[PDB]
Amino acid sequence: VHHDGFQTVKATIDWEHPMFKLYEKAKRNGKWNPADIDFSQDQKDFASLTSEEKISALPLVAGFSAGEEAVTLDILPMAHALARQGRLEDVLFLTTFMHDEAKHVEMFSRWQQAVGIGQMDLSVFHNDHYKRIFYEALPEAMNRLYADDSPEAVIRAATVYNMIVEGTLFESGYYTFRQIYKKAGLFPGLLQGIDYLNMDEGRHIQFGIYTIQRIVNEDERYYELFIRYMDELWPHVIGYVDYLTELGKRQQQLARTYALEIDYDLLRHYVIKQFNLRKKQISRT
Amino acid sequence: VHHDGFQTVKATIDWEHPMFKLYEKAKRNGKWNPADIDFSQDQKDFASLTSEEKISALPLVAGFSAGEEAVTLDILPMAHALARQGRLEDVLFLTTFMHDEAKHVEMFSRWQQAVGIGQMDLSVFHNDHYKRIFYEALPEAMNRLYADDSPEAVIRAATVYNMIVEGTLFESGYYTFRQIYKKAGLFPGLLQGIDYLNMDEGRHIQFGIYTIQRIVNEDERYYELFIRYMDELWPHVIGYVDYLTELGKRQQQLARTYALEIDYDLLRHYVIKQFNLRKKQISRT
Ligand SMILES: CCCCCCCC(=O)O
Ligand SMILES: CCCCCCCC(=O)O
Ligand SMILES: [Fe+3]
Ligand SMILES: [Fe+3]
Ligand SMILES: [Mn+2]
Ligand SMILES: [Mn+2]
Ligand SMILES: [Mn+3]
Ligand SMILES: [Mn+3]
Numbered sequence: 274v275h276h277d278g279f280q281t282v283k284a285t286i287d288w289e290h291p292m293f294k295l296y297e298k299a300k301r302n303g304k305w306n307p308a309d310i311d312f313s314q315d316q317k318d319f320a321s322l323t324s325e326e327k328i329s330a331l332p333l334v335a336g337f338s339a340g341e342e343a344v345t346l347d348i349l350p351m352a353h354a355l356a357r358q359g360r361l362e363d364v365l366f367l368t369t370f371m372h373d374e375a376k377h378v379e380m381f382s383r384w385q386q387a388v389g390i391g392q393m394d395l396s397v398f399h400n401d402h403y404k405r406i407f408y409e410a411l412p413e414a415m416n417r418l419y420a421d422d423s424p425e426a427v428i429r430a431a432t433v434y435n436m437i438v439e440g441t442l443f444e445s446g447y448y449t450f451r452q453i454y455k456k457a458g459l460f461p462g463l464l465q466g467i468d469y470l471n472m473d474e475g476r477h478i479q480f481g482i483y484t485i486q487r488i489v490n491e492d493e494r495y496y497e498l499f500i501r502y503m504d505e506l507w508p509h510v511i512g513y514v515d516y517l518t519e520l521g522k523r524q525q526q527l528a529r530t531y532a533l534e535i536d537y538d539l540l541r542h543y544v545i546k547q548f549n550l551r552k553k554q555i556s557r558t
Numbered sequence: 559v560h561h562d563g564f565q566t567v568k569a570t571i572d573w574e575h576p577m578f579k580l581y582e583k584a585k586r587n588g589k590w591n592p593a594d595i596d597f598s599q600d601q602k603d604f605a606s607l608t609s610e611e612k613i614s615a616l617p618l619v620a621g622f623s624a625g626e627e628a629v630t631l632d633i634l635p636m637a638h639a640l641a642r643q644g645r646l647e648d649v650l651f652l653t654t655f656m657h658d659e660a661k662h663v664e665m666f667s668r669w670q671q672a673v674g675i676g677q678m679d680l681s682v683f684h685n686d687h688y689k690r691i692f693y694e695a696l697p698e699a700m701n702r703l704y705a706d707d708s709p710e711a712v713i714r715a716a717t718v719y720n721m722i723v724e725g726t727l728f729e730s731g732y733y734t735f736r737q738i739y740k741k742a743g744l745f746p747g748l749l750q751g752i753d754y755l756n757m758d759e760g761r762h763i764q765f766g767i768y769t770i771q772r773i774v775n776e777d778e779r780y781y782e783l784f785i786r787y788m789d790e791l792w793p794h795v796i797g798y799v800d801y802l803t804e805l806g807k808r809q810q811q812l813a814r815t816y817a818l819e820i821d822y823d824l825l826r827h828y829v830i831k832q833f834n835l836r837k838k839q840i841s842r843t
Binding site: 276280282296297308342352361371375394407408413419 | 560562569571573624626646653657660661677693
């Protein structure tokens with residue numbers, strides 16, 4: 274449908290808009306390039322591993338790789354919906370968000386290729402709870418926005434995408450990955466890339482907080498929708514966590530080799546802590 | 559709708575895909591930041607101008623500013639359509655395209671703000687032919703892709719967006735701007751920014767060529783659709799050109815002051831040349 278006018282012809286950008294400020298920070302802080310990461314040591318590390326130790330690492334990489342690819346595809350309807358509402362500064366920021374996620378997809382795929390598992394199908398490590406979030410609930414909630422950009426729909430999309438997928442699952446998975454392979458001294462290239470992902474993902478979560486809060490600000494009853502949508506997804510979050518925990522407890526060979534007391538009870542509580550602090554970044558009032 | 563799988567879990571990125579290579583070049587060559595351009599001299603230049611000389615420059619800036627904003631909003635459906643076709647490397651590249659266009663919107667709006675015309679509504683310099691392309695034909699052709707991603711629809715979208723708007727109008731407007739203010743020694747910040755835009759816009763046109771050619775490759779009868787769609791838009795392209803030419807010939811005070819023989823007959827032929835060379839970058843066979 275037609276444009277009825279253009280904000281940067283009638284006026285200018287709103288320079289004080291928080292999403293313009295987040296866009297400015299994204300450009301300053303978003304220069305890293307996955308093509309510059311040296312993965313040569315990661316290739317040697319992975320080759321030096323036993324077949325048993327090789328499994329230990331792949332579940333998390335399977336969840337990350339599909340997850341980055343899903344959000345790369347699935348952020349587009351948010352950008353559409355906010356563009357159609359005339360939120361120009363939000364759109365500008367979302368271009369950095371989308372470009373970040375492209376680099377995240379690229380980074381994991383470069384690592385898979387470098388270490389020699391690119392020809393290997395990692396979908397086996399997606400159980401039913403993972404599929405429910407990433408193959409179903411995430412794309413349903415984002416795609417809805419093409420036909421329904423009601424406050425309810427926008428809160429649900431930001432909750433699933435930014436508060437659950439990024440703010441709970443990815444944050445916990447990054448913690449987990451550091452807590453294991455940084456200790457073991459393994460996979461330096463991948464850990465460099467993950468550190469970059471984690472920096473980008475702070476801006477993505479901030480966008481989600483801003484979006485949810487500005488809707489709650491209009492009407493505190495949206496607050497209850499937010500909590501409800503968070504709690505509806507919790508079972509699949511912990512059901513993927515329990516399944517990875519069960520996979521890790523079945524293959525405790527890397528823990529032994531590298532002298533890691535992988536405390537799954539401590540990981541689990543980090544997931545719970547992440548989930549609960551995302552709730553507290555949204556004020557009812 | 560659901561994801562049935564993820565390419566970077568089952569396989570990797572197709573590293574040899576031309577759009578992956580264009581994505582790689584976009585990251586290497588896309589570091590510039592409009593926030594780093596010094597516009598202080600542009601502010602003084604614009605203040606030093608007479609009111610008559612002030613008009614001379616605004617028509618082109620009005621067309622650029624609305625144009626960048628239109629393509630920022632209107633590239634999203636292309637990214638959607640190709641994502642839904644599973645063209646992952648195209649999507650990765652299109653994230654750089656979208657982020658480039660955000661910076662183009664930002665750059666013109668920073669210049670308008672710096673020189674003191676931000677509070678001024680430049681829509682008056684959009685005649686009916688401009689509105690037909692940017693307010694109507696462009697968004698219609700891109701938005702169509704949400705419901706109709708047939709080869710015909712994709713060629714039409716790339717033709718309007720990449721071959722006409724970028725490949726004819728923007729290219730000619732950049733030439734024009736250099737041919738005038740680079741000669742006059744005016745507006746150094748804006749000319750720096752335009753030089754950056756022009757570098758980005760080479761990649762955007764290449765995406766359009768690749769997209770049109772790969773469809774023509776399937777069936778040379780799409781070639782005739784391409785030419786037809788180019789010729790349908792030509793009247794509005796030259797009708798905006800004739801109208802800017804008429805505006806420039808009515809305000810020949812900047813030419814006098816700055817000793818510029820602004821050869822509109824030479825500009826006009828550059829537009830015609832641009833239009834015809836875009837046609838020749840698509841092979842029938
Ligand atoms: C032990 C808890 C692990 C949570 C890992 C989430 C990984 C992901 O899919 O991004
Ligand atoms: C004298 C020919 C001028 C063509 C200017 C196109 C400017 C634009 O809208 O990008
Ligand atoms: Fe993210
Ligand atoms: Fe462009
Ligand atoms: Mn279960
Ligand atoms: Mn006319
Ligand atoms: Mn990511
Ligand atoms: Mn542009």
